[PDB]
Amino acid sequence: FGEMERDCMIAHGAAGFLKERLMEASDAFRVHVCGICGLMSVIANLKKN
Amino acid sequence: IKQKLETQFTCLFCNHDNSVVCTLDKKNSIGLLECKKCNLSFQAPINSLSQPIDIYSDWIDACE
Amino acid sequence: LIDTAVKTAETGYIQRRLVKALEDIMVHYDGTTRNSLGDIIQFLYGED
Amino acid sequence: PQRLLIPTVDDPGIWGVKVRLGKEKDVVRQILKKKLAREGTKNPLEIYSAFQRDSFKGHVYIEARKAEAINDALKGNVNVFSNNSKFLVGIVEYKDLLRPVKLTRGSYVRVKNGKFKGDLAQVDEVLENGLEARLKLVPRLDYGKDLSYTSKFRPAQRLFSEAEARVHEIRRDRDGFVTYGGEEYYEGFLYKTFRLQNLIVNSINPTLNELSLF
Amino acid sequence: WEEPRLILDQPAQHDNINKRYEIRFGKIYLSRPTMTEADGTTHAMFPQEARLRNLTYSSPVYLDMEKSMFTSIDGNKVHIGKVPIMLRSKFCSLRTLDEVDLYKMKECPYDMGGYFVINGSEKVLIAQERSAANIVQVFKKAAPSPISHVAEIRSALEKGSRLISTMQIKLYGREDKGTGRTIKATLPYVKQDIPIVIVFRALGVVPDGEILQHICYDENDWQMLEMLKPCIEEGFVIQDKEVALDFIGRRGSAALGIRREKRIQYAKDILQKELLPHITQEEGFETRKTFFLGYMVNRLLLCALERKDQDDRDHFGKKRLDLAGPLLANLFRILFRKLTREIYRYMQRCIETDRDFNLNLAVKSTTITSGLKYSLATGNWGEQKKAMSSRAGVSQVLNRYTYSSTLSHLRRTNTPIGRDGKLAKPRQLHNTHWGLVCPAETPEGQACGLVKNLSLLSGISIGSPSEPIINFLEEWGMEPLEDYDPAQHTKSTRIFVNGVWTGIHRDPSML
Amino acid sequence: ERACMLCGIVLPGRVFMQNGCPNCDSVLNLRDSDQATVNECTSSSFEGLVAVGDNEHSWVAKWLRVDRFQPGLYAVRVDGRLPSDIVAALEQYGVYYRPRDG
Amino acid sequence: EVEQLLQFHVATYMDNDIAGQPQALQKSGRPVKAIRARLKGKEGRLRG
RNA sequence: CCUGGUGUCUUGGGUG
DNA sequence: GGATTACACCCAAGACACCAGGCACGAG
DNA sequence: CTCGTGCCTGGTGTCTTGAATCC
Ligand SMILES: [Zn+2]
Ligand SMILES: [Zn+2]
Ligand SMILES: [Zn+2]
């Protein structure tokens, strides 16, 4: 899904479709951030919560 | 107009490198080498085509 | 054959710069045409 | 006293010169040949000495009175960089250029060669002459299991077990001392001689595993 | 025989005893390709086995080497490597056999060869297009440049055929800009452009009147003479040979401080060799270079005077095709020097032991064998450590999809200009391609117009010695260059043999 | 190559066997020794190769205490020490051993 | 010489296209892929 | 008795 | 002095060197 | 049985000099 296909979906105004293609249908990832310093420096043990 | 140029030549006497300054006066066809360290001076004739390497060459032969 | 093969990349570069220049330009609900900074480019789209 | 031999302004100068890595000893050699060959001729090589320190890779130092002699010493030498890169050393830096510089029984060292490479060992004793040291080592043995070794295909470390050797594959020599496959094991440890140059005595860092064991 | 001897020396003081160690390379002998198993057994290798077992179809090469030992108080057939053999050539085991036995060797009689086998893969060499050597070309320069016309030549020897150096003559001064419109040249291994008159004087011809007699052969042409006017005055103060030669040496990339007593003698080498080496390199022949230099300046001004068009870079007569022969020689040359230095570096250690070296321990055949195999397998034309800057794609896997495709692939040519640089001139079908390369067959895409294919009746010159041609020209009336004067010879024709001006003849029509 | 522990000179080992040490052999007698003796007085392990061309006027030579010796190759550091029995014999000869091992 | 070499390695670790000096090379002979080169061009992190 | 990893960097030749 | 130079796709074809040290085998 | 030489494996470390237009 190259740069030129990205532009076509903008022209159609299909913003919802473009988001899904580039996330859920590919390499979607969850990260944690610190609300104070804004870095991805959070150490998250999910079973210990 | 005179040309005052710094060079990367080594003085034949004090051995300090990058301390020889060349003043080429083409209006009178007189070139001048100067040492920014030990303070010596050497004079030699220059043409219109000469460059700091031309008089510094003449200084090597004037010693030997 | 040379012309078609050469000048296709000339126009391909043209289209790429045009898209990046204009991609963020949107019609807003007041009829103005604006970019992402909210600068007004036209007070009414296409003047009509 | 060494303090009376310090250099003065009356002593020759010392220049450093950049040379091809690994070719420093060769350049020192070549300079000596040139010096000796020209002694007594009308064009002697006017250098006094030249040397190269291992700690100072890629450099040779040359002792003389005039810079021109340095250029003369190196002329045509294929191991020397042609750029006019020599540098002057200060008199106050001379002796440090010539600084020459452990191991005690009961201390630990790390082995540098063989299947025991990287292993911690106790220094048991050294040879009379002074070259190889007897080391006490946790063995890496198979009890002849697949006989009819390298450091990449060796065995895990485990104390020698003489009853296992008795069962599976051995000469008793003393209390707790066995010779097994021509190596000596005393109270479970290998005692084996290594060249001193084959052990590391400095800056050893015990590992987690070594703290657990020793 | 390009560098036929290795020489060492030590002035024994350890009763001085100069002991020169010398090694001389002699005759070359070739053997048919042989498979040597890990066993040690050998047999003749035929291609079908070589394809199947991913072997290289190559011949062992043996070289005579001779030792000699000068001592003054004051070998045999060593193996140097394997060379891949082109199938169906004279050194391939299939060249004989005859149709009956070809079928037994599993070889197809329609297979015409022309390719190599490297690790089981069939590799064909692609003809490389280059500009001719030893020819003068004049081009015009773009507007924002002080130069308006440039003459250029890349000089290359006849023996071997290999590149040496490149030389340029630039005409400065724009249209009514550039004031004094003088001419300076560019010399190999000299940092700055040197005016023409200075190099004329530096070769041994110093008074003005002789200089102009070497360039312009028409005393009436005042337009041409007016353009050489500023060149005389900007090089007037250099009035003799010695100060001319020293003016050169003070720029030629050397060290600082070689004094006038020797800086002349260093520049005399840069003039005798490297500058126009295709004419001659022996001493006492500077008359040929001075006469040739005048010809160049003459050609330069004809284009600047708009009496002759600038040269057309795409004219096919100014082009050459490097095929399998020349391409291998250039690669073999580079690798044989590499083998040579490893022998030299090995003697300096093995003679300090004062032990007779067994020769076979001082020739590592991996240098040539791995060198040729690697370059033929990847197409990277150079030493492996220098894979960039080297030319790529000279060797390619032979396309065997269909029979027609095999014929086309073996007759392909390549121009190595790039994909960088748009325009059209190297890509266009030029008029002079008629009958020499196909007007129809060219790839689509990025290579379009740069990769070409030889027409059906084309051939490529194998090369011929120029020496018999000289003998024929002098026998039928050609007059030497020392007998030539533009006042007496205001009408005779100049004669060139491989780009060097060698003589003049007054009646060319019969000749 | 080995280095003499007494004077620091660097020579091919066989030289120590053939001719003895050129600086030391008046007291060390390596010429007339066995290989065990040569190997106790000379070391295969040394560092800092020094070309001494002019012993008597070199500061480098004076620092290394080779200024009274012959021109040649010397080592800054020689590993090992002379055996105590040989040190004792040298001392009987009025020779004082100053170790060159650092 | 040793401090300048630490400066060198830290520089070509981030950018190995420094103008006016030779590139850091792998033992294979090809240039080291620095972080700057990871992000630029058609195949890098942003366009690719 | 559910989970289940096979390379990269180039170069060259091709397709629209 | 650098940076710019269409898009996507297919497939076949390749890979560190030298020196030193240690161990094993053969010959005296 | 001992010594020397050759081969293999592991560890550490580079260098003889030799495509064109624009801002
Ligand atoms: Zn935070
Ligand atoms: Zn001075
Ligand atoms: Zn001694």
TrEMBL record, chain B:
Any single biological process term in GO: transcription initiation-coupled chromatin remodeling
A GO term for molecular function: zinc ion binding
The entry's keywords: Metal-binding, Nucleus, Transcription, Transcription regulation, Zinc, Zinc-finger
Residues that hold Zn(2+) 2 according to the record: 11, 38
GO cellular component: transcription elongation factor complex
Location of this chain's protein in the cell: Nucleus
UniProt binding sites for Zn(2+) 1: 11, 14, 35, 38
Annotated function: Transcription elongation factor implicated in the maintenance of proper chromatin structure in actively transcribed regions.
Family: Belongs to the ELOF1 family.
Protein name: Transcription elongation factor 1 homolog
Native organism: Komagataella phaffii (strain GS115 / ATCC 20864) (Yeast)
Residues of the full protein shown: 15 to 78 of 110
Automatic annotation (TrEMBL), chain C:
TM region positions: none
Annotated localization: Nucleus
Function: DNA-dependent RNA polymerase catalyzes the transcription of DNA into RNA using the four ribonucleoside triphosphates as substrates.
Similarity-based family: Belongs to the RNA polymerase beta' chain family.
UniProt-recorded name of the protein: DNA-directed RNA polymerase subunit
The organism of origin for this protein: Komagataella phaffii (strain GS115 / ATCC 20864) (Yeast)
Taxon lineage: Eukaryota, Fungi, Dikarya, Ascomycota, Saccharomycotina
Automatic annotation (TrEMBL), chain D:
Transmembrane segments: none
Chief location bin: nucleus
Keyword field: Nucleus, Transcription
Keyword field contains Glycoprotein: no
KOW domain sequence ranges: 102-129
Single GO MF descriptor: U1 snRNA binding
Any GO BP: intracellular mRNA localization
Transcription keyword on record: yes
Family stated for the protein in its record: Belongs to the SPT5 family.
Full protein name: Transcription elongation factor SPT5
Organism: Komagataella phaffii (strain GS115 / ATCC 20864)
Upper taxonomic lineage: Eukaryota, Fungi, Dikarya, Ascomycota, Saccharomycotina
Residues of the full protein shown: 213 to 450 of 908
UniProtKB/TrEMBL annotation, chain E:
Domain RNA polymerase Rpb2: 133-322, 396-458
Family stated for the protein in its record: Belongs to the RNA polymerase beta chain family.
Biological source species: Komagataella phaffii (strain GS115 / ATCC 20864)
Protein name in the entry: DNA-directed RNA polymerase subunit beta
Domain RNA polymerase beta subunit protrusion residue range list: 1-370
Subunit structure: Component of the RNA polymerase II (Pol II) complex consisting of 12 subunits.
Location within or outside the cell: Nucleus
Function: DNA-dependent RNA polymerase catalyzes the transcription of DNA into RNA using the four ribonucleoside triphosphates as substrates.
Included range, full protein: 51 to 589 of 1227
